[PDB]
Amino acid sequence: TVLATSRLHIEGDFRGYGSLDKSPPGALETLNRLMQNNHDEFDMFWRPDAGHNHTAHSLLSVYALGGSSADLERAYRDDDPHQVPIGAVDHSVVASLKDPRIFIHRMQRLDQYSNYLRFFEERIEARGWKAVVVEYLFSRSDAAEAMLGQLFEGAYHPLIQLGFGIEFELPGLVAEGLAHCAAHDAANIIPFFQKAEKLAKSGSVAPAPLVELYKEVRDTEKIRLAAKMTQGPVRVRDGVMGEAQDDIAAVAAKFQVGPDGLKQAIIETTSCAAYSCGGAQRPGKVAKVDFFFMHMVVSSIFLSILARQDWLETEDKIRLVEWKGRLDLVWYAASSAPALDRKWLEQYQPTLSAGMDWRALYRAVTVEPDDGHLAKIVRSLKWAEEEAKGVETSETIPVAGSGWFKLAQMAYDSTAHLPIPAKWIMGAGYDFLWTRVDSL
C-alpha cells in the first residue's frame, strides 16, 4: 500500500532559514523530482564509517541559497558516491517494531534504515509527523531517551536529516531523519550524555561559560590526548569515550542553560563552534577549516529551527541545545583540542571571495562542485548572523558581528576549486595533518 507520507512535495514559497534570492523558475520542480528519487532509490548509509547520504542536504541547501535547476542537478551528481540502492524492507520486521522492546533491540544497526523508514512512514501516516517526533524523541520512554542520544551521532547527521524534514515540514523527510536516528551505529556517546546530565541536575556542579569548557578540554591532558590521529572516523568511540568518557562528562556537566536562556545558549554554542573553525589556524599556513568543527557549525541552524517549533516544550528545546553544546566538546577533543585564537578570523583577508556580499557568495556556492557541506556551512553562518543580531564579541561570545561572514569567506576560499578530500582538514589539532597543507 502506497502512503501519502512517501511523497515528498515542497509547495508554497518557504525557501529555508537564511534564504536571500529566490531560485529562478524551474528549480522547485527539479528539487521535488530529485528529493523523491533520492528518497525512493537510495539508502541513508553507503559505507560503515562516515557514509551518511548528503543528497537531501545538498539539494535543500542549494535551493535555500537560490540555486537554479542546473545547480540542483550539479548537487545531485556531485553526491553520486553517496547514492547506493536502499536495502530491501522486511515487512514482518516493520510489523514487529510496534513493540517498544524489539524497537530498542534493533537500534544502532545501519542495515535497518529501510525497515525503520517504512515503520516511521506508517506511524506518520496514522498520526501527524509532529506526534511521531514527540513520541520517539521527547516522550522520556526508554526508546525516546536512546533516540535522543542517537540524534547527535556521527557528528550530527541524524539531527541534520530530521532538521531539514522539520524545517520544510516534509513528512517523508522527517521519516528519513527518524529512521537515520534509529539505525545509526553507536559511538558510546549515550552514557556521556547521561553522565553529563546527571551531574548537571545534581546541584554539585556550578555552571561555566562554554568558551571555558573548550579551554578545560585542551588544558586536561587525559582528555586532549584521548583521541589518536589514525583512529580516523572512530576517534570518539575508541578514543574520547574509550579513554576519557567520565572526565569529559564532568567538564560537559558545567554547560547549564537557565529557563530563560534558550536564545543566548544557541548563540553561545554557535559562536564557540564558529570560533573552533576560524580559530584553529597555524602560523605560515593557508587557512583551513576542520571537517568536524564545520559539522558543529552546520548543525547549529537546526537548533535555531527546532527552537521555533510551537509543538515542542521550551524545556526540550533547552535540553537539545545543552546536549549539542556538550557533544561539541567531544568533537573538539577528537580533533586534539587545537589552540584557538580570535586573531585569525579578525586578520583573515578574503581571496577568491574578496569583495563578495552574502548574495554573491551564495551564488558562487550554488555552482561550486561540492558534496553539500559548503552550502550548509555558509547558510548556517548567514542564519547565525540573524540569530545573534545586536550581540557583539565578549569574553563568552568569541565570534559575532562581521565574524560570521568572514568565516563563510574563509570556508569558500579554503575549499573552492579543490577535490573533496583536500577541502577540510581532518583534525586541526594533529600537527602532522598541517604538513600536507600549503605554506603561505
Site for a second copy, residues 111 to 150, rule: CB under 8 A? 111
Nearest CB to a second copy, comparing residues 182 and 265: 182
Q: Is 222 in the site for a second copy (CB under 8 A)?
A: no
For residues 249 and 226, the answer to whether their CB atoms sit within 8 Å is no
| Interior/surface letters 56-87, b for 16+ CB within 10 angstroms, e for the rest | bbbbbbbbbbbbbbebbbbbbebbeebbeebb
For residues 388 and 300, give the distance between their C-alpha atoms in angstroms, rounded to a whole number: 12
CB 252 within 8 A of CB 368: no
Q: Locate cell 545509526: which residue?
A: 184
Rounded Cα gap, residues 164 and 60, in angstroms: 8
CB nearer to a second copy: give 207 or 233.
233
Stretch that binds a second copy, among 99-107, 196-204, 227-235, 289-297 (CB under 8 A): 227-235
Q: In this chain, which of 36, 96, 108, 231 binds a second copy, going by CB under 8 A? A: 231
The interface region with a second copy, picked from 168-176, 229-237, 246-254, 315-323 by CB under 8 A, is 229-237
CB of 46 to a second copy, least distance (A): 6
- Closest residue by Cα to residue 176 from 372, 335, 41: 41
- 439 counts as binding a second copy under rule CB under 8 A: no
Residues 361 and 398: their CA atoms lie apart, in Å, by 23
Q: Pick the binder of a second copy from 229, 305, 422, 437 (CB under 8 A).
A: 229
Is residue 324 within 8 Å of 197, Cβ to Cβ?
no
Nearer to a second copy (CB atom), residue 84 or residue 144: 84
Interior CA angle at 267 toward 415 and 160, to 5°? Answer: 55
Q: Does 292 bind a second copy (CB under 8 A)?
A: no
236 binds a second copy per the rule CB under 8 A: no
Query: Which position among 24, 26, 48, 258 is part of the footprint of a second copy (CB under 8 A)?
Result: 48
Number of residues written out for the chain: 440
What is the size of the binding site for a second copy (CB under 8 A)?
A: 20
232 binds a second copy (CB under 8 A): yes
| Contact stretch for a second copy (CB under 8 A) within 40-48, 135-143, 279-287, 387-395 | 40-48
> Does 240 interact with a second copy (rule: CB under 8 A)?
no
CA distance 6 to 37: 11
End-to-end CA distance of the chain: 60
- Which residue's CB is nearer to a second copy, number 6 or number 231? 231
Q: How far is residue 160's CA from residue 430's CA, in Å, rounded to a whole number?
A: 27
Give the one residue of 3, 20, 84, 250 binding a second copy; rule: CB under 8 A: 84
- From candidates 175, 213, 226, 234, binder to a second copy by CB under 8 A: 234
- Would you tell me which residues interact with a second copy (CB under 8 A)? 43, 45-49, 51, 84-85, 110-111, 228-234, 238, 432
